[PDB]
Every structure is written in structure tokens, then in C-alpha cells.
């Protein structure tokens, strides 16, 4: 089969700056009709891929003028003249010149932006969950940059370990930020034994850690 090798595997670009992604084929990709069916797709998390470029250099309808493609023989290049926030995602090259059709491994494009401190919110367990014998406390870190952020859970000021899970979003297509959700899960009995539930956040945008807390019952 024809192997499509993409370079680089990932890149981080400030908006307004150029980006260049290379796609190398293991064999030539000239179809019987003389055309090279080399495509470039963009895929965002949880979405289907979207066509950007077809037949090496043709810009698909609705695709910004900022995107262009070139190439011959075994080396193909996608160029973004000036990167924008909406360009975030994974870029794939694809050949449809010879069966079986094959894709590149993908190139992740990340966007650089200014430091943004998170907005921190805390949610006590719902009455509905408490009725089921469990208590989940949620700490939300909204729209921050860079992605690196540290959450620490404290119960009556005692640092917790092994009772929480967190996940970070993909980078936002509009503002280039990230958000993070952390859940502290206790049994209802353990939850009722303590008063103060706190989420302590460390981030580059903060000069000292931010503590968001509540008193159980209040």
C-alpha cells in the first residue's frame, strides 16, 4: 500500500503567522487520468473530517484564501498564509489516486495566545445525588491559557488524594483557551463528616493560588 507520512507531528503557531505541513507518499500518486488526487482535511474533536484542498492545489468551496496546497511526485505541502484561531485541530493528507486509498497520520495544529487566568467555580453535590448515597463536588476552571493548570482538593483544609478525576477540553476554536473540570467523589457518609470543601487552583495567570470553597449545608 501507499504510505502517507506527515511532517511535523504537531506545531504551535501565533495567529497572523504562517504554518506549513508536509505529506510524503511512499510511491508516486499519479492516477491513470494524469491527475494527483491528493487531499487535505481538517478534523476537530468529536467531528467528521472537513475537506480543505483536493487534487493537490484546488481550494474546496467555502475554504478561506489563507489555505493553499502544492506538490509533485512524492512531496506535498499544505500552507496556511496567516494562521487564525479557527484553524485549530488535526490536519490529514489523503491520496485517492490508487486503491486502497490511504491517509497520513495527522498533524496537530495548536494556537498560541496570551496568558489568561481561569475563572474558578465550585458546585456542591446535588440533592438528587445525595439521595442515592454518593456526593460529587465539581470544580470548574473556565477559559484559561496555557493548558497547564493544577487543581488540589482540600476538605477541612486537609489535602485530598485518590478520590478525584479531571479532564481538559480541546483548545477552543474561537478564543484559543482551555477549560478543565475536576470531580471529587466521596460516599454520602464521608461527605457528611466534614464542613469545608475547597478547590485550590494554581495557573500561570495567577500570582498566588485561588481557593474556591463552600460550607456543607450553607
Amino acid at each position: 500500500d501507499i504510505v502517507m507520512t506527515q511532517t511535523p507531528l504537531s506545531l504551535s503557531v501565533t495567529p497572523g503567522q504562517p504554518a506549513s505541513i508536509s505529506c510524503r507518499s511512499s510511491q508516486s500518486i499519479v492516477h491513470s487520468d494524469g491527475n494527483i488526487y491528493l487531499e487535505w482535511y481538517l478534523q476537530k474533536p468529536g467531528q467528521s473530517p472537513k475537506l480543505l484542498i483536493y487534487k493537490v492545489s484546488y481550494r474546496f468551496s467555502g475554504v478561506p484564501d489563507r489555505f493553499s496546497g502544492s506538490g509533485s511526485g512524492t512531496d506535498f505541502t499544505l500552507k496556511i498564509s496567516r494562521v487564525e484561531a479557527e484553524d485549530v485541530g488535526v490536519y490529514y493528507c489523503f491520496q485517492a489516486s490508487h486503491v486502497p486509498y490511504t491517509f497520513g497520520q495527522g498533524t496537530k495544529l495548536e494556537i498560541k495566545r496570551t496568558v489568561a487566568a481561569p475563572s474558578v467555580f465550585i458546585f456542591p453535590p446535588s440533592d438528587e445525588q445525595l439521595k442515592s448515597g454518593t456526593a460529587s463536588v465539581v470544580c470548574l476552571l473556565n477559559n484559561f491559557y496555557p493548558r497547564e493548570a493544577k487543581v488540589q482538593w482540600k476538605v477541612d483544609n486537609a489535602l485530598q488524594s485518590g478520590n478525584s478525576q479531571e479532564s481538559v477540553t480541546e483548545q477552543d476554536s474561537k478564543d484559543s483557551t482551555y477549560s478543565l473540570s475536576s470531580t471529587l467523589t466521596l460516599s454520602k457518609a464521608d461527605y457528611e463528616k466534614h464542613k469545608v470543601y475547597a478547590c485550590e487552583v494554581t495557573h500561570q495567570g495567577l500570582s498566588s493560588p485561588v481557593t474556591k470553597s463552600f460550607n456543607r449545608g450553607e
Partner: protein, 220 residues
């Protein structure tokens, strides 16, 4: 408007079979070949094969012969992809896609169907509100959400107000608990001034367990 609407997420035990559908509209179904693409962790995007909608003729990627069976029903404009002798490695998102130019540069894609192959028990989630309060406000804005707890396998989808509320929504990637159950949260930032006049409902779907919940999130 060309549309490719795929069937919902499925969960199957090893050794079983699954038949994913792709309903086409907005174009003459017999005009274009229907292609199937797999997106599996590690393996990336792979073209599985194509179906000629007129005669049901098929060309498979050799890697998928004996695994995939592609068919079509012209009377309902529906293409099908059947996976046999399911194994863990078959866990992937399956896409149907077409090239409306009549050439194989794919311009329209289905939303994808996640097929999970597991012997673990299917579990529907509990949906709990994350009520807006003085602990979830920030300079005139209020954050609120839904906690979608303890489900298996993926995926859970969340919309707000039947898709009418999209601005300021963050639906987080699911976390895998030690128990082997997933959990996820979906949040939205809204004006704190209108908490008394606007209604916020999270629409949670977990197709493998037939879970379909519309949870109204009440202010505290």
C-alpha cells in the same frame, strides 16, 4: 442540502456482528459511490472500501476483507456496513462518506458511528444538575451544568435547550473511573441577571443503554 445520517452508537460482545446504517438525502442516491472510513485509536483514518449504489458492487481495502460487508437499499437511499466476528480491535468510529464531484475526494461525511466491542456490562448514566449559585458566579455571569455519572461504554452526547444554546458550552472529555465506568460534565456560562426568566435544560443521550434524559437545571 446533502446529508448523510448514520445510526447510533453500538456496543457488542466479542464474536458478535453489527450492521451500521447511513441514510442519504439531498441528492440522487445512485449518483455517487458510498465509501466507508474507520477511525480507530492508534490506527488513525483508514479507507475500508466503496459500494456502487446502482448494482451493489463493492471494492474492499484488502485489510478489511472478511471483516466488513458493504450493502445498500436503493428504495430507502440507505447504505450499510456490517462487521462480523467482532474483536476489541474493531472498537472505532465508522464514517460513511461521498465525493459529489463523481471523483473520490470526499466532500460530505456522516456524523460517524462509534462501535465498542466489550464483554463489560453496559450501564446507563445518572444525570445530576450543577445548579448556578453564588459559588458559580463571575462578574455578572453564572456557570451551570450537568454531571453525567457512571456509564459504559462511550459515547454520551449533551446538548443544551435542544441545540438552541451553544455559546459558552464546554462538554468535557469523559473520565474513566477505577470501576471501568465513565463520567463527564457539560457546563455553560449564562447571564446571572436572567436566571429567573430563562430555562436551562441539558439533553443527555447514551444510545447503548437507551438513556434519553432532559434535565432542567434550577437556580439555587
Amino acid at each position: 442540502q446533502v446529508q448523510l445520517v448514520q445510526s447510533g452508537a453500538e456496543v457488542k460482545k466479542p464474536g458478535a456482528s453489527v450492521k451500521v446504517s447511513c441514510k442519504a438525502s439531498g441528492y440522487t442516491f445512485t449518483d455517487y459511490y458510498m465509501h466507508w472510513v474507520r477511525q480507530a485509536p492508534g490506527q488513525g483514518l483508514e479507507w475500508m472500501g466503496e459500494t456502487n449504489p446502482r448494482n451493489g458492487g463493492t471494492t474492499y481495502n484488502e485489510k478489511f476483507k472478511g471483516k466488513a460487508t458493504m450493502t445498500r437499499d436503493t428504495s430507502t437511499s440507505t447504505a450499510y456496513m456490517e462487521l462480523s466476528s467482532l474483536r476489541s480491535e474493531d472498537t472505532a468510529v465508522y464514517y460513511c462518506t461521498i465525493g459529489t464531484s463523481g471523483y473520490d475526494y470526499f466532500d460530505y461525511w456522516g456524523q460517524g458511528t462509534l462501535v465498542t466491542v466489550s464483554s463489560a456490562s453496559t450501564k446507563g448514566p445518572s444525570v445530576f444538575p450543577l445548579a448556578p449559585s453564588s459559588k458559580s458566579t463571575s462578574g455578572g455571569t453564572a456557570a451551570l451544568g450537568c454531571l453525567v455519572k457512571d456509564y459504559f461504554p462511550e459515547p454520551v452526547t449533551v446538548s443544551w435547550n435542544s441545540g438552541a444554546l451553544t455559546s459558552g458550552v464546554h462538554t468535557f472529555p469523559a473520565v474513566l473511573q477505577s470501576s471501568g465506568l465513565y463520567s463527564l460534565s457539560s457546563v455553560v456560562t449564562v447571564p446571572s441577571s436572567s436566571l429567573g426568566t430563562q430555562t436551562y435544560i441539558c439533553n443527555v443521550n447514551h444510545k447503548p443503554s437507551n438513556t434519553k434524559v432532559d434535565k432542567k437545571v434550577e437556580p439555587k
